[PDB]
Design a protein around this ligand. Sequence first.
Ligand SMILES: NC(=O)C1=CN([C@@H]2O[C@H](COP(=O)(O)OP(=O)(O)OC[C@H]3O[C@@H](n4cnc5c(N)ncnc54)[C@H](OP(=O)(O)O)[C@@H]3O)[C@@H](O)[C@H]2O)C=CC1
Length: 425
Amino acid sequence: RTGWFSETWRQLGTADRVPGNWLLLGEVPPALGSLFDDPLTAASWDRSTAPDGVLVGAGAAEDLLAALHEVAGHPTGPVWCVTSRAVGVGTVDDPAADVRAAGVWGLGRVAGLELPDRWGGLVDLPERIDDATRRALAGTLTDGEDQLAVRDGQLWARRLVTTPAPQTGTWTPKGTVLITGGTGGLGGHVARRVAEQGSADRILLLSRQGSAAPGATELLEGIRAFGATAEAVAVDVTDRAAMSGLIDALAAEGAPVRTVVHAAGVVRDVRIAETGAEELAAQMAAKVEGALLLDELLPDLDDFVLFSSISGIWGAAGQAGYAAGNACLDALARRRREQGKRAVSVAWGPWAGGGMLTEHDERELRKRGLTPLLVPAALQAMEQAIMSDRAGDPVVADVTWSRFLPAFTASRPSPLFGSFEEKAA
Ligand SMILES: NC(=O)C1=CN([C@@H]2O[C@H](COP(=O)(O)OP(=O)(O)OC[C@H]3O[C@@H](n4cnc5c(N)ncnc54)[C@H](OP(=O)(O)O)[C@@H]3O)[C@@H](O)[C@H]2O)C=CC1
């Protein structure tokens, strides 16, 4: 049975300062630096002394990555990371989405899994740090929650819960459908689904390999049987000149892009300790910079569909960059909807039937309570997510909680999944 889940936030039921010898990294603003008496910086810290805590001010995943490299191999107290505009609590005073800040949370969750005894947590604060905000943070740093937000002086804690699955009509995309990563595994399944519907004029499969991609010839032949024209174009989704050229040429033909499905991306297994800034950027490029470029160049679309991952929802060891990029996608969908435009980001669990996952990957996933979604089930859930009468960003995965939770929490407890614990209501 296909699991549908969503992020939600629980309002929790405060100090004037934070005692001790703290190390402040990244950009900690003056209204927070003043909570600490004589705090250390990266420059002033004598690495032989263990600070009582670390506070990292991060605007993007790279900032948190840099801070974690600074403290690697040195004893410190808990490492806490503060952001702003990184999460949407669902209150009236929620700020507008900051795509790059959201990446901090994707990476930070992975830090919790890789460095379970060292990682403190994430706190999202309002942009303007008033006295109420100062006190909420101080109480948090002085006092098991590790994914927190401050809104109107109150603390909220992040949770993952079930939602209802949308019950919708049929997805019938029209005109030109652009599928980035379209010659890949999931891209190909989506391409065939679109073709089968018989609603579109043109299906464009975009990837760096284009028509030179393995399997592309057979994929295109199969699509071309159904009525729409189809082509594979060899284009880097991060290349502004190439992307703008393609989009402009289609509009000039009277066949402008009307739907985007963004499945371009890469996945690597590299611990934070082994991930440099350049590699982090390479890991995030197609997924994040591609999506941002698409959003910019295509303000008027019927649909803008981002293929995200459970990695950006709850994290996995070795997936810092992958998780960060996926968290960015979820934020971009929120941002685009705030601008009055259609967008959905579906945070998928593993799929069966090819792509990123090898036969062996699939068997290890099942071990930790993740069963690959069958392709028909996944595609149906995709249609449901797109055609939903209400905006949301769904998490869609086949999770067996009795196996998943003990594996996920083996090295570190997780209040995120409270609703799946023994006797949870
Ligand atoms: N398989 C799964 O279980 C899961 C997949 N996802 C997401 O689905 C998407 C596709 O996954 P999947 O089909 O498995 O993976 P694939 O590797 O099969 O497909 C990825 C595609 O992205 C393309 N790509 C990578 N970089 C660029 C770039 N700079 N410009 C244009 N295209 C690029 C690749 O082609 P090329 O190298 O030719 O450029 C390839 O076609 C990914 O974004 C992934 O994160 C999410 C959750 C689960």
